[PDB]
Design a binder for this molecule. Structure first.
Ligand SMILES: OC[C@H]1O[C@H](O[C@H]2O[C@H](CO)[C@@H](O)[C@H](O)[C@H]2O)[C@H](O)[C@@H](O)[C@@H]1O
Ligand SMILES: OC[C@H]1O[C@H](O[C@H]2O[C@H](CO)[C@@H](O)[C@H](O)[C@H]2O)[C@H](O)[C@@H](O)[C@@H]1O
Ligand SMILES: [Fe+2]
Ligand SMILES: [Fe+2]
Lengths: 192, 192
C-alpha cells in the first residue's frame, strides 16, 4: 500500500508565501486522499505490485488520476523550500539563460503559461530529449512524467486548493510566493 | 459589451449554506473576470455582435472558455435560492421519480456524480430529447447548452472556488448546502 510521504519541511516553513493552513489541507488532506483512493483501487488489478511511477505510466481512469496526483504533489512539495527562491544557480540557471536568454524572460514566460493554465492544472519546468529546457502545461492529473524522453524538473500546482486560502482568486500573488520558494537544488538534481 | 448580471438575491440570502464571502469572490470576482475577459476578446471580431449563447455555441479556445463560463455561472446563481431547498415540486419532482424511482435515489446519484467529477467541473441536471431527466458532468467551461437535444435544468459548480472558503476540501458538505438551496422554481421553469 502506498503511503503519504512526510512534508520535506515544517508545516510552518513556507510562511509567509504558503501558509500553515494551506499545507495542512493541501498535503494533510488533498495529497492523502489520492493515496487512500489509489490504495483502494489497486487490489484485484494488474497494478497490484507495480511502483507508483510504473502505475502512473501504465494506467488510465481512476487509478491514473489518483496515482498521478500522488506523484505530482510529491514532486511539487520538493519543488518548494524554506531555503529556495531568488536567482537560479548551477546547471539550471545556465540552461535557463541558454533557452530564454535571461532568468527574467524565463520567469515572465512561466508566469504567463501559469496564469493562463485554465482550470485545475499544473505548469512544469521540463528538460527535453534534446537537453533543452521548456515550460509545459498539463490539465487535472496529467503529467510530463509519462512523456517519453521528457524529464520533469520543477512544477507548480495551479489547482485552486493550492492557493485559494492564501490568495483567493489572484494567481499572480500565488506565483509570487512560488518564486520566493522555488527549490533550485531540487531543480538542479533533476536536471543532472 | 457583456455585463455582469446582478445576483438574484441579497449577498447573505444563501447563508449559512453559501457565505456572503463566497458570494463576493465567486460572483463579484470570478464571474466578473469572465465578463471582462470576453469583452476584452471580442472587439473587432465575428463574435462582436452576437448574443452570449450564440458565442458559446460558435467558438472555442479562450472566447469559448469565457463565454461558456459567464453563461454557466449565471445559470448557477439561478439554480440556488434563499427560498429553495428541500423537496422538489411540480413537473420536475415527477420526472425525477420517473427516472430515479424517488427523490432520495436522485440525490444519491447526483452527489455521487458531483463528488467524483474530477478537477474544475460542473454537474448538471438535464432534460434529454426523449423528455426524461439525466445528470451529466462537464469539465472546466464545457456546458450541455451546446449538446443537441439536451436542455440544462440545474447546475452545481464544482470548481474549488465555489466552495473552498466555506467547505475547504469537503465536497459532500458543500453538496448538502446545495440541497438546502436548490431552486425548484428555476428547475421547473427550465423544464416546461
Ligand atoms: O476515478 C473516477 C473517474 O474519474 C474521472 O471521471 C470523473 O471526472 C470526470 C472529469 O474529470 C467526469 O467527466 C466524469 O463524469 C467523472 O466520472 C475519470 O475520467 C474516470 O475514468 C474515473 O473512473
Ligand atoms: O485563451 C487561452 C487558452 O486557454 C486554454 O488553454 C490554456 O489552459 C489549458 C488548460 O485548460 C492549458 O493546457 C493551455 O496551455 C493554456 O494556454 C484553451 O485551451 C486555449 O484554446 C486558449 O487559447
Ligand atoms: Fe494540489
Ligand atoms: Fe465558479
Amino acid at each position: 500500500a502506498f503511503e503519504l510521504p512526510s512534508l520535506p519541511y515544517a508545516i510552518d516553513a513556507l510562511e509567509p508565501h504558503i501558509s500553515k493552513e494551506t499545507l495542512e489541507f493541501h498535503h494533510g488532506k488533498h495529497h492523502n486522499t489520492y493515496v487512500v483512493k489509489l490504495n483502494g483501487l489497486i487490489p484485484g488489478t494488474k497494478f497490484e505490485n507495480k511502483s507508483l511511477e510504473e502505475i502512473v505510466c501504465s494506467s488510465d481512469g481512476g487509478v491514473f488520476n489518483n496515482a498521478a496526483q500522488i506523484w505530482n504533489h510529491t514532486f511539487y512539495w520538493n519543488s518548494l523550500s524554506p531555503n529556495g527562491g531568488g536567482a537560479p544557480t548551477g546547471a539550471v540557471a545556465d540552461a535557463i539563460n541558454a533557452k530564454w536568454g535571461s532568468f527574467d524572460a524565463f520567469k515572465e514566460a512561466l508566469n504567463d503559461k501559469a496564469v493562463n493554465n485554465f482550470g485545475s492544472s499544473w505548469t512544469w519546468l521540463v528538460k527535453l530529449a534534446d537537453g533543452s529546457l521548456d515550460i509545459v502545461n498539463t490539465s487535472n492529473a496529467a503529467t510530463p512524467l509519462t512523456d517519453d524522453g521528457v524529464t520533469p524538473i520543477l512544477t507548480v500546482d495551479l489547482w485552486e486548493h493550492a492557493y485559494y486560502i492564501d490568495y483567493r482568486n489572484v494567481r499572480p500573488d500565488y506565483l509570487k510566493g512560488f518564486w520566493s520558494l522555488v527549490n533550485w537544488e531540487f531543480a538542479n538534481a533533476n536536471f543532472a
